[PDB]
Scaffold this active site. Structure first.
Site, PDB file in Angstrom:
ATOM      1  N   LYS D  11       1.626  -2.912  11.735  1.00  0.00           N
ATOM      2  CA  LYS D  11       1.846  -2.223  10.480  1.00  0.00           C
ATOM      3  C   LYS D  11       0.527  -2.152   9.716  1.00  0.00           C
ATOM      4  CE  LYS D  11       6.772  -3.442  10.161  1.00  0.00           C
ATOM      5  NZ  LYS D  11       7.842  -3.917   9.252  1.00  0.00           N
ATOM      6  N   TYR D  51      13.057   5.053  11.311  1.00  0.00           N
ATOM      7  CA  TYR D  51      13.982   4.129  10.630  1.00  0.00           C
ATOM      8  C   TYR D  51      15.238   4.867  10.141  1.00  0.00           C
ATOM      9  CZ  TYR D  51      10.087   0.767  10.323  1.00  0.00           C
ATOM     10  OH  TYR D  51       9.063  -0.093  10.605  1.00  0.00           O
ATOM     11  N   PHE D  59      16.896  -0.640   0.364  1.00  0.00           N
ATOM     12  CA  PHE D  59      15.477  -0.933   0.400  1.00  0.00           C
ATOM     13  C   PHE D  59      14.652   0.091   1.192  1.00  0.00           C
ATOM     14  CE2 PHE D  59      17.756  -2.859   4.014  1.00  0.00           C
ATOM     15  CZ  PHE D  59      17.140  -2.196   5.057  1.00  0.00           C
ATOM     16  N   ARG D 104       4.050 -13.535  12.738  1.00  0.00           N
ATOM     17  CA  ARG D 104       4.585 -13.503  11.376  1.00  0.00           C
ATOM     18  C   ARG D 104       4.042 -14.700  10.588  1.00  0.00           C
ATOM     19  NH1 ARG D 104       9.049 -10.412  13.086  1.00  0.00           N
ATOM     20  NH2 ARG D 104       8.853  -8.314  12.196  1.00  0.00           N
ATOM     21  N   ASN D 114       5.106  -7.660   6.724  1.00  0.00           N
ATOM     22  CA  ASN D 114       5.348  -8.688   7.732  1.00  0.00           C
ATOM     23  C   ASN D 114       4.594  -8.347   9.024  1.00  0.00           C
ATOM     24  OD1 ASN D 114       7.021  -6.622   8.601  1.00  0.00           O
ATOM     25  ND2 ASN D 114       8.804  -7.931   8.978  1.00  0.00           N
ATOM     26  N   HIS D 117       6.201  -4.852  13.728  1.00  0.00           N
ATOM     27  CA  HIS D 117       7.585  -4.584  14.089  1.00  0.00           C
ATOM     28  C   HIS D 117       7.720  -4.649  15.615  1.00  0.00           C
ATOM     29  CE1 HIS D 117      11.276  -1.974  14.547  1.00  0.00           C
ATOM     30  NE2 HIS D 117      10.565  -1.622  15.627  1.00  0.00           N
ATOM     31  N   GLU D 128      13.183   3.847  20.617  1.00  0.00           N
ATOM     32  CA  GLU D 128      11.956   3.646  19.829  1.00  0.00           C
ATOM     33  C   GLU D 128      10.729   4.128  20.622  1.00  0.00           C
ATOM     34  OE1 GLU D 128      11.662  -0.423  18.420  1.00  0.00           O
ATOM     35  OE2 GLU D 128      13.269  -0.137  16.956  1.00  0.00           O
TER      36      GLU D 128
END
Lengths: 143, 143, 143, 143
Positions: D11, D51, D59, D104, D114, D117, D128
């Protein structure tokens, strides 16, 4: 004169009215060879970077908004005197001033939605093509 | 009934004789929408993997040879009953046995150099499309 | 002085022995930023259109053969004086002549299988990067 | 059961603090193989689609904001029970609760930021991976 390259973008107006095949044939009939092609959805940033030239222009915002309103088709055309030739069959930027038989005459609705974009020069073409395509992606024809 | 997708490959015979625009317009005229496109030159492995289904079939290697002899154009076509419709206007695999007006009739020279390939079913389309395109690259039309 | 860019290729020897993370971290520790990356299997054609410069050199054949023997990782590194810096931590082209701590010292087996390639000047970098990446693919970062 | 594949996204938090090499090496040390990689800047549209599963969750908006705040790195990892192994090294989604030695624990600042993914199952992985990569782009290792 030598074989040159130019960039063709079929803009979202022409893509969405399904005239892609029609436009590409015009280029081919004129003796240009399509040596790269990919349909892509430009992000806002991508569009801004391509037209960075006109960043300080008046209507940059509308141009960018139009070019990201849907998917475009980005193309590299190769052939003798390719730049001037692409320009010829595309026609004047303003569609009402364009000659009969040109792409702007036959497909363009307005100044903004003028169907397609093309490189205006030798030097502009090099930059525009390099922006969208790595050199290895360009497949000039062999047989 | 629903809108489907199918893969179109314009093979190197049709690319090199500059009939790409001509072929794409045929699809568009029939009411199919081109929702992805890119010109690529398939490597040996690329080709073998795509035709993995016929690996066991004997000629296979002439097909591989032909499909990697030059650049091809890979596309995804979207529309109502897209599978059967693409197949209709493509025509019989064997060009001499194809009807008048089809792509095989008008562009194909032989069995081997038969201009274009298309998905032959619902299920084969999903696999063929996934092979060449990530799902994010497929740009459904909104305008 | 100014922030520059250079190309990094992790060659197939280093990819296949799973040292990619190790090599990339070396670049990062030295204060270079990875601003583009993609793993590709170079085609026989791709073969050193990249190494077109050494096309007349004797052992060109082996270089090409090695570079297509498996997947490589192609990268653009950005930072202050990036060209000389990449070269520093890479080390001498011969691994046995390479300094302690360098990539060539730690990962390279021989002259042929020397782990990684890098751009040797500002000018060669511009060409090498443009060859593999369109300008839009290069993501200089902000945040 | 045989080798599996899973998707890894580093990320923008981890990209921008230049820990890409560090994270990738963790995967390699665990005996996973990087069989595809590309750095991309996700547009709004791209992120929302990936997503799509959580689009009704509250959220969602912040997740999308974060994932498009800068460039990410998308990866396909291959190896024996790759899915659970990727998850092991990564650690708990919540970095508080993550074990010592995990990504993490070592790189993640908060729940939102975080670091990375991963795919959570066989089935989620297939989709994915297909979303970001055409099957031909995935280069399983030879040699």
């Amino acid at each position: 004169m030598a074989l040159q390259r130019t960039l063709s973008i079929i803009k979202p107006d022409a893509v969405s009215k399904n005239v892609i095949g029609e436009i590409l044939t015009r280029f081919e009939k004129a003796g240009l060879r399509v040596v790269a092609a990919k349909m892509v959805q430009l992000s806002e940033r991508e569009a801004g970077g391509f037209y960075a030239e006109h960043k300080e222009r008046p209507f940059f915002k509308d141009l960018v908004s139009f070019m990201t309103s849907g998917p475009v088709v980005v193309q590299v055309l190769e052939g003798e005197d390719a730049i001037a030739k692409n320009r010829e069959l595309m026609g004047a930027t303003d569609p009402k001033k364009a000659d009969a038989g040109t792409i702007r005459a036959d497909f363009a609705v307005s100044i903004d939605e003028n169907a397609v974009h093309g490189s205006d020069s030798e030097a502009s073409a090099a930059r525009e093509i390099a922006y969208f395509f790595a050199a290895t992606e360009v497949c000039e024809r062999i047989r």
